[PDB]
Structure formats: C-alpha cells, structure tokens
C-alpha cells in the first residue's frame, strides 16, 4: 500500500513526511519499456513529487521535472493535493547501464511548476549541480524557502517489483503567528499614508503604526546605488 | 537617507522590514529620459527588491524583473546582501501618460532570480495577473513560500524629486527549531536503511527511527496513480 504519513516533532517544531510507492510506481512504468536507469529517476521523482505535494497549503497540482541534453531529455511527475500521481520520461538516445542521474539528464535543470486550482501558475528552476535529485531539490529550497528543509529518497526492488520511498523534514512556522494576528498587523500597516512613510523618520512611522505592539528594532542598514 | 530597518514583533513572531529610497532611486533614474510611468515601476521594483534582499540567509544577489510585450518590454532591479542597488528599463514603444503597470508591461511575468555568491542560480516566474506589483509578488510568495508574507509599496514625490518606500511582513520560523536540533533529526533519518524503509510498516520505521523523540502522527493519506 502506497501511503504518505504526516508527523510532527512536538518539542522541536519540525514537521515530517514519510512515503512509499510500489502500487503507483508500477502503474506509471508498465507499458513503457523504460531501461533501468530511467525507471530509477522516475522512482525518485515520484517520491519527491508526492512529498512536495503534501506541503501545498492550497488545492492544485505540482509537477517536478528534469530537462536536459543527455539521452533522457525529459522526466516528469505530476501530483495534486489528493496525492494522485502520473508521469512519463522521454528517452532520445543511448542509455548506458548503471547510468547516474547526471548522465541520463545531460546539462539541464530541475523544474518545479505549481499550478493551483484557481490561480496563476508558478515555476521555479535550478540547474543540476547535483549527484542526487534530493541534493538538487534541497538546493532549490535553500534558495526559495526560508524554512530549512531536508529530503531523503530511497529506491530499490521488492519482490522483483520496483519500489521507492522517502521522507521530508521541514521547520514549522511559529505557532504564535496565528493568521488572526498576522492579518491584523498586515491590516495595520496598510493604513500607512504614502506621504507619511516618505517624509517621516523611520522610528516615527514605526510607533505611529505599532505603538500598541511590543516591537524590537535592529540596527539600520544603508541602501545605496551600485555604481561602477 | 535610504535605509532598511529590520524589526520583530516579539509577541507574535512576525519579522518586519521598513525601507525608503530617494538617494538611490535618483541615481538609478538620472541620465535616462524615462517617462513618468516607467519611473514609477522602477520605484516599486527598487522597494520590492531591496526588501527581498534583506531576507537572504546567504550572500549573493537577487534581481526582480518584469518582462512583457507592452511598450516597456523590460524593467529590472538588482541588489545584493549589502543592499547595493542598480537597474534599468527598456522602452520599445508608445508609453501613454498615467499608464498602469498592466499596460507598460504587456503580457508578461515577474521573474525573481536569486544567484548566490557560491552556488547555482535559482529563478522563479509567475504571470502578471495583478493590478499591483506588490499583489503579484505576494502571489509569488503564496506559491513558493510556506511562511505567510505581506508587502506594502508606496511611491510618490518629495521636493519635486521622486521617492519610494515600502514594508514587508513575514511570519517567523519556529524558535524551538534550533538548527542544532533540526540537524540532529536530519542526521537521524539519514540512517534509514533503504531495505528498512521499503519493507517495514510506516509506524515501525517511525519508532525504529524516532523512539527517543516526542512525535505525533496523523492519519495516513493514500497515494495513487491518476489513470484516465
């Protein structure tokens, strides 16, 4: 049985995800005489995608794909908030046995595209400077997410049949930051008169805005023009 | 004086940023007979970029640009961890007075590109389904960031000279989630034997891994193939 389990480290404020594919991976590979190397990355993408799927805070579908000039020019996996997966790979050449991710995909990128059920599509890209899909994905989050995140992907065979699983670790956003409060602050600052903001000293705008709240201000930083 | 002030709402775990440009904006506009409408979006991008700049957790430069088919096919602003800004705009046609963002930029996108000082470049894209740059940017974060985020951008003139300012609100990541602890958990799960993960029931992998920690597991979710 393919299932995704969500778990929380109560004392450390770190959410976790554990998942396994076999049933789903089987259905995605049957009737595609994919060589072994291709079947392996698809296993990894299926795990990666399924885990990323469970982090959505809204309803829509996410797809994680690899693109490159190597023999496997395309490998993609798509899932939705309901954990329904599907995908394909495109082999355009000679695929050597025991081929590593970096050779199957030549020079390319990982492309995360998040298209919601009502809204406009988002797409993130990062090159494949990695020996591991999980390493590349972690690189992606390091550049696009404040919350530290870790990924673990395992691939192998069980009963001659291919199987894969993985886990994800990610820091939680502060508890104290209840939407109710955040929305209040956000509604509070939107009352900032543009003339008010552009003429008064910073410390004044601050208290004129948040005199009711407990606020800590740190040292200012000079913003300047980068002239040649 | 152009400065970026960082502040924290102690009780609510919400970091804030307040910034103003005038000196820097002046230097970026002089010797470019940009019409007014173009000067306005550049003001917004300069505020937006400077704020985003201050969220970097590593050293490198970020650039926020608009691209489209309208009269202003390109508008970009680039900054680094040290808050050094620079940018340009490309006008390729008739730019109507009192032109709104949606007309200056025809049909295009917002393109955030984060290239660090050692590492590989990242790039995020989202279409301009917005009447406001801040609305589009917020849309971007909603799809790429777990931490709720809000942006406020104000543009106007002070002493006949152009000026702009803005503020950003963003939930903080849990305090409890000290890197030391997170790294421990991350090192803990990486000891998961692939055969262990792919053959044992979930609840067993969990305790066989985190029996020392206080963990809460929620209802599992079925992961399946999306057949037509």
mmCIF file of C-alpha atoms in Angstrom, chain A residues 21-214:
data_model
loop_
_atom_site.group_PDB
_atom_site.id
_atom_site.type_symbol
_atom_site.label_atom_id
_atom_site.label_comp_id
_atom_site.label_asym_id
_atom_site.label_seq_id
_atom_site.Cartn_x
_atom_site.Cartn_y
_atom_site.Cartn_z
ATOM 1 C CA UNK A 21 5.327 3.855 -3.662
ATOM 2 C CA UNK A 22 5.068 0.468 -5.284
ATOM 3 C CA UNK A 23 1.492 0.208 -6.424
ATOM 4 C CA UNK A 24 1.631 3.667 -8.019
ATOM 5 C CA UNK A 25 5.159 3.315 -9.369
ATOM 6 C CA UNK A 26 4.159 0.027 -11.014
ATOM 7 C CA UNK A 27 1.257 1.705 -12.836
ATOM 8 C CA UNK A 28 3.485 4.544 -14.038
ATOM 9 C CA UNK A 29 6.081 2.184 -15.524
ATOM 10 C CA UNK A 30 4.010 -0.557 -17.109
ATOM 11 C CA UNK A 31 3.803 -0.419 -20.900
ATOM 12 C CA UNK A 32 6.889 1.769 -21.313
ATOM 13 C CA UNK A 33 9.920 -0.414 -21.893
ATOM 14 C CA UNK A 34 11.992 2.093 -19.908
ATOM 15 C CA UNK A 35 15.513 0.868 -19.305
ATOM 16 C CA UNK A 36 16.572 0.552 -15.649
ATOM 17 C CA UNK A 37 18.339 3.936 -15.268
ATOM 18 C CA UNK A 38 15.218 5.776 -16.437
ATOM 19 C CA UNK A 39 12.999 3.731 -14.098
ATOM 20 C CA UNK A 40 15.221 4.798 -11.213
ATOM 21 C CA UNK A 41 14.892 8.580 -11.663
ATOM 22 C CA UNK A 42 11.143 8.213 -12.149
ATOM 23 C CA UNK A 43 11.059 6.430 -8.803
ATOM 24 C CA UNK A 44 12.932 9.333 -7.217
ATOM 25 C CA UNK A 45 10.702 11.950 -8.867
ATOM 26 C CA UNK A 46 7.596 10.096 -7.749
ATOM 27 C CA UNK A 47 8.810 10.157 -4.147
ATOM 28 C CA UNK A 48 9.980 13.753 -4.390
ATOM 29 C CA UNK A 49 6.765 14.890 -6.023
ATOM 30 C CA UNK A 50 4.488 13.062 -3.634
ATOM 31 C CA UNK A 51 6.284 14.598 -0.637
ATOM 32 C CA UNK A 52 6.187 18.110 -2.121
ATOM 33 C CA UNK A 53 2.540 17.531 -2.879
ATOM 34 C CA UNK A 54 1.743 17.192 0.815
ATOM 35 C CA UNK A 55 3.172 20.624 1.584
ATOM 36 C CA UNK A 56 0.639 22.523 -0.509
ATOM 37 C CA UNK A 57 -1.413 24.963 1.570
ATOM 38 C CA UNK A 58 -3.987 25.244 -1.210
ATOM 39 C CA UNK A 59 -5.587 22.982 -3.865
ATOM 40 C CA UNK A 60 -3.800 22.485 -7.179
ATOM 41 C CA UNK A 61 -1.208 20.292 -8.828
ATOM 42 C CA UNK A 62 2.562 20.289 -8.632
ATOM 43 C CA UNK A 63 4.962 18.801 -11.140
ATOM 44 C CA UNK A 64 8.701 18.206 -10.739
ATOM 45 C CA UNK A 65 10.645 17.581 -13.909
ATOM 46 C CA UNK A 66 14.176 17.164 -15.154
ATOM 47 C CA UNK A 67 15.180 18.534 -18.556
ATOM 48 C CA UNK A 68 18.486 18.207 -20.350
ATOM 49 C CA UNK A 69 20.543 17.310 -23.401
ATOM 50 C CA UNK A 70 21.525 13.813 -22.242
ATOM 51 C CA UNK A 71 19.884 10.577 -23.542
ATOM 52 C CA UNK A 72 16.845 11.157 -21.302
ATOM 53 C CA UNK A 73 15.848 14.675 -22.370
ATOM 54 C CA UNK A 74 12.696 14.651 -20.217
ATOM 55 C CA UNK A 75 11.439 13.045 -16.957
ATOM 56 C CA UNK A 76 8.372 14.385 -15.184
ATOM 57 C CA UNK A 77 5.999 13.509 -12.344
ATOM 58 C CA UNK A 78 2.791 15.326 -11.557
ATOM 59 C CA UNK A 79 0.599 15.179 -8.479
ATOM 60 C CA UNK A 80 -2.275 17.035 -6.855
ATOM 61 C CA UNK A 81 -3.351 17.839 -3.313
ATOM 62 C CA UNK A 82 -5.170 14.463 -3.294
ATOM 63 C CA UNK A 83 -1.920 12.595 -3.876
ATOM 64 C CA UNK A 84 -2.855 11.359 -7.352
ATOM 65 C CA UNK A 85 0.316 10.739 -9.362
ATOM 66 C CA UNK A 86 1.205 10.306 -13.045
ATOM 67 C CA UNK A 87 4.230 10.869 -15.252
ATOM 68 C CA UNK A 88 6.417 9.877 -18.200
ATOM 69 C CA UNK A 89 10.025 10.017 -19.386
ATOM 70 C CA UNK A 90 11.462 10.698 -22.838
ATOM 71 C CA UNK A 91 14.477 8.707 -23.969
ATOM 72 C CA UNK A 92 16.144 10.150 -27.060
ATOM 73 C CA UNK A 93 19.335 8.123 -27.219
ATOM 74 C CA UNK A 94 21.813 5.555 -25.966
ATOM 75 C CA UNK A 95 21.264 4.940 -22.242
ATOM 76 C CA UNK A 96 24.258 3.153 -20.600
ATOM 77 C CA UNK A 97 23.679 0.557 -17.890
ATOM 78 C CA UNK A 98 24.280 1.835 -14.352
ATOM 79 C CA UNK A 99 23.827 5.369 -15.653
ATOM 80 C CA UNK A 100 23.840 8.061 -12.983
ATOM 81 C CA UNK A 101 21.329 10.918 -12.875
ATOM 82 C CA UNK A 102 23.923 13.310 -14.303
ATOM 83 C CA UNK A 103 24.353 11.236 -17.486
ATOM 84 C CA UNK A 104 20.727 10.323 -18.159
ATOM 85 C CA UNK A 105 19.941 14.025 -17.979
ATOM 86 C CA UNK A 106 22.751 15.829 -19.739
ATOM 87 C CA UNK A 107 23.072 19.503 -18.975
ATOM 88 C CA UNK A 108 19.730 20.588 -17.644
ATOM 89 C CA UNK A 109 17.582 21.701 -14.774
ATOM 90 C CA UNK A 110 15.039 20.663 -12.205
ATOM 91 C CA UNK A 111 11.801 22.500 -12.905
ATOM 92 C CA UNK A 112 9.166 22.811 -10.217
ATOM 93 C CA UNK A 113 5.883 24.085 -11.500
ATOM 94 C CA UNK A 114 2.990 24.721 -9.104
ATOM 95 C CA UNK A 115 -0.322 25.486 -10.846
ATOM 96 C CA UNK A 116 -3.300 25.907 -8.498
ATOM 97 C CA UNK A 117 -6.907 25.052 -8.941
ATOM 98 C CA UNK A 118 -7.854 28.772 -9.059
ATOM 99 C CA UNK A 119 -4.937 30.997 -9.814
ATOM 100 C CA UNK A 120 -1.921 31.566 -11.918
ATOM 101 C CA UNK A 121 0.855 29.041 -12.417
ATOM 102 C CA UNK A 122 4.251 29.400 -10.719
ATOM 103 C CA UNK A 123 7.527 27.897 -11.938
ATOM 104 C CA UNK A 124 10.935 27.566 -10.300
ATOM 105 C CA UNK A 125 14.170 26.455 -11.929
ATOM 106 C CA UNK A 126 17.643 25.449 -10.784
ATOM 107 C CA UNK A 127 20.437 23.664 -12.636
ATOM 108 C CA UNK A 128 21.501 20.104 -11.908
ATOM 109 C CA UNK A 129 24.733 20.734 -10.000
ATOM 110 C CA UNK A 130 23.925 17.543 -8.129
ATOM 111 C CA UNK A 131 24.799 13.867 -7.865
ATOM 112 C CA UNK A 132 21.432 13.364 -6.250
ATOM 113 C CA UNK A 133 17.916 14.513 -7.020
ATOM 114 C CA UNK A 134 17.362 15.082 -3.290
ATOM 115 C CA UNK A 135 20.530 17.204 -3.183
ATOM 116 C CA UNK A 136 19.304 19.296 -6.121
ATOM 117 C CA UNK A 137 15.855 19.676 -4.592
ATOM 118 C CA UNK A 138 17.348 20.722 -1.288
ATOM 119 C CA UNK A 139 19.404 23.281 -3.167
ATOM 120 C CA UNK A 140 16.179 24.575 -4.675
ATOM 121 C CA UNK A 141 14.541 25.001 -1.271
ATOM 122 C CA UNK A 142 17.589 26.661 0.170
ATOM 123 C CA UNK A 143 17.190 29.397 -2.443
ATOM 124 C CA UNK A 144 13.383 29.593 -2.447
ATOM 125 C CA UNK A 145 12.328 28.740 1.120
ATOM 126 C CA UNK A 146 13.191 30.335 4.454
ATOM 127 C CA UNK A 147 12.142 27.225 6.389
ATOM 128 C CA UNK A 148 15.095 24.787 6.433
ATOM 129 C CA UNK A 149 14.119 21.596 4.620
ATOM 130 C CA UNK A 150 15.617 18.131 4.210
ATOM 131 C CA UNK A 151 14.789 15.298 1.818
ATOM 132 C CA UNK A 152 15.562 11.586 1.849
ATOM 133 C CA UNK A 153 14.866 9.369 -1.130
ATOM 134 C CA UNK A 154 15.386 5.615 -1.308
ATOM 135 C CA UNK A 155 14.982 3.423 -4.321
ATOM 136 C CA UNK A 156 15.135 -0.338 -4.787
ATOM 137 C CA UNK A 157 13.270 -3.519 -5.564
ATOM 138 C CA UNK A 158 10.865 -5.569 -3.503
ATOM 139 C CA UNK A 159 9.643 -8.894 -4.896
ATOM 140 C CA UNK A 160 11.365 -8.270 -8.212
ATOM 141 C CA UNK A 161 8.931 -5.358 -8.459
ATOM 142 C CA UNK A 162 10.343 -1.788 -8.249
ATOM 143 C CA UNK A 163 9.672 0.258 -5.117
ATOM 144 C CA UNK A 164 10.625 3.623 -3.688
ATOM 145 C CA UNK A 165 10.134 5.670 -0.575
ATOM 146 C CA UNK A 166 11.323 8.847 1.045
ATOM 147 C CA UNK A 167 10.922 11.302 3.876
ATOM 148 C CA UNK A 168 10.984 15.034 4.253
ATOM 149 C CA UNK A 169 11.896 17.233 7.195
ATOM 150 C CA UNK A 170 10.961 20.893 7.465
ATOM 151 C CA UNK A 171 10.917 23.518 10.180
ATOM 152 C CA UNK A 172 7.495 24.786 11.176
ATOM 153 C CA UNK A 173 6.342 28.405 11.070
ATOM 154 C CA UNK A 174 5.858 29.959 14.522
ATOM 155 C CA UNK A 175 2.789 28.945 16.488
ATOM 156 C CA UNK A 176 2.419 32.409 17.907
ATOM 157 C CA UNK A 177 1.977 33.651 14.328
ATOM 158 C CA UNK A 178 -1.747 32.871 14.230
ATOM 159 C CA UNK A 179 -3.298 34.078 10.986
ATOM 160 C CA UNK A 180 -5.672 36.262 13.010
ATOM 161 C CA UNK A 181 -2.771 38.248 14.482
ATOM 162 C CA UNK A 182 -0.708 38.384 11.299
ATOM 163 C CA UNK A 183 -3.744 39.648 9.358
ATOM 164 C CA UNK A 184 -4.208 42.343 11.974
ATOM 165 C CA UNK A 185 -0.640 43.615 11.637
ATOM 166 C CA UNK A 186 -0.972 43.443 7.859
ATOM 167 C CA UNK A 187 -4.180 45.471 8.015
ATOM 168 C CA UNK A 188 -2.463 47.785 10.465
ATOM 169 C CA UNK A 189 0.445 48.716 8.208
ATOM 170 C CA UNK A 190 -1.717 49.127 5.093
ATOM 171 C CA UNK A 191 -3.050 52.316 6.690
ATOM 172 C CA UNK A 192 0.353 53.900 6.184
ATOM 173 C CA UNK A 193 -0.214 57.155 4.296
ATOM 174 C CA UNK A 194 2.321 57.272 1.474
ATOM 175 C CA UNK A 195 3.202 60.864 2.397
ATOM 176 C CA UNK A 196 3.574 59.694 5.965
ATOM 177 C CA UNK A 197 6.049 56.965 5.005
ATOM 178 C CA UNK A 198 8.108 59.088 2.614
ATOM 179 C CA UNK A 199 8.634 62.151 4.841
ATOM 180 C CA UNK A 200 8.793 60.981 8.454
ATOM 181 C CA UNK A 201 11.803 59.361 10.104
ATOM 182 C CA UNK A 202 11.598 55.553 10.345
ATOM 183 C CA UNK A 203 11.350 55.312 14.129
ATOM 184 C CA UNK A 204 8.316 57.613 13.925
ATOM 185 C CA UNK A 205 6.452 55.648 11.256
ATOM 186 C CA UNK A 206 7.068 52.577 13.378
ATOM 187 C CA UNK A 207 5.447 53.876 16.590
ATOM 188 C CA UNK A 208 2.846 55.883 14.715
ATOM 189 C CA UNK A 209 1.884 52.435 13.344
ATOM 190 C CA UNK A 210 2.759 49.891 16.034
ATOM 191 C CA UNK A 211 2.729 51.849 19.307
ATOM 192 C CA UNK A 212 0.335 49.224 20.736
ATOM 193 C CA UNK A 213 2.631 46.293 19.995
ATOM 194 C CA UNK A 214 5.852 45.030 21.567
#
